[PDB]
């Protein structure tokens with residue numbers, strides 16, 4: 219449903235938080251404290267230093283496995299996210315061609331070196 | 341002293357980047373291990389605006 223981006227991912231320094239809730243999307247750059255295996259039903263704990271937030275319409279809409287492409291890129295604080303959705307008939311990345319519309323840019327202003335995906339158990 | 345500032349850091353800053361972490365500074369070949377001392381500078385000092 220989302221990702222965790224950061225250079226430390228250890229609540230010592232800033233680490234953004236993203237989620238595709240069935241109701242919306244929520245991105246907050248706080249000194250979040252997670253657990254060893256964070257998944258939604260509670261993913262975080264003890265939200266500290268909450269400095270930036272964003273909530274809008276959720277990201278992912280709906281035999282064919284749906285493909286969702288994203289380009290996560292950061293320039294001079296402006297973290298750029300691109301959105302794409304495409305149905306795929308039933309693995310292998312589909313050899314073809316398409317483009318990605320931009321979706322949103324946010325001025326988080328953090329140092330990012332690693333990123334870990336937020337996944338659900340089942 | 342509501343306002344403070346940084347003067348020592350391992351590397352300079354990035355455009356539109358606000359470095360905020362309170363990490364002890366090592367100015368010498370020896371580490372600091374999170375304890376004040378020689379080559380152990382708290383990253384932030386305060387101005388005496390008088």
Ligand SMILES: *[C@@H]1O[C@H](CO)[C@@H](O[C@@H]2O[C@H](CO)[C@@H](O)[C@H](O)[C@H]2NC(C)=O)[C@H](O)[C@H]1NC(C)=O
Pocket residue numbers: 266267360362
């Ligand atoms: C994040 O919140 C923490 C509180 O848990 C802040 O901690 C103190 O903040 C004051 C603000 O002037 C500092 O003087 C203290 O040295 C901080 N102490 C500790 C133990 O962190 C922290 O400053 C906040 N960070 C930001 C960027 O606002």
Ligand SMILES: *[C@@H]1O[C@H](CO)[C@@H](O[C@@H]2O[C@H](CO)[C@@H](O)[C@H](O)[C@H]2NC(C)=O)[C@H](O)[C@H]1NC(C)=O
Pocket residue numbers: 225329330331350351352353354
């Ligand atoms: C953002 O974080 C990265 C990861 O630590 C920094 O890259 C390191 O910088 C230190 C000096 O501060 C070097 O000693 C390391 O060799 C660098 N590589 C690593 C560990 O990734 C990067 O410098 C940080 N951004 C800025 C502007 O300093």
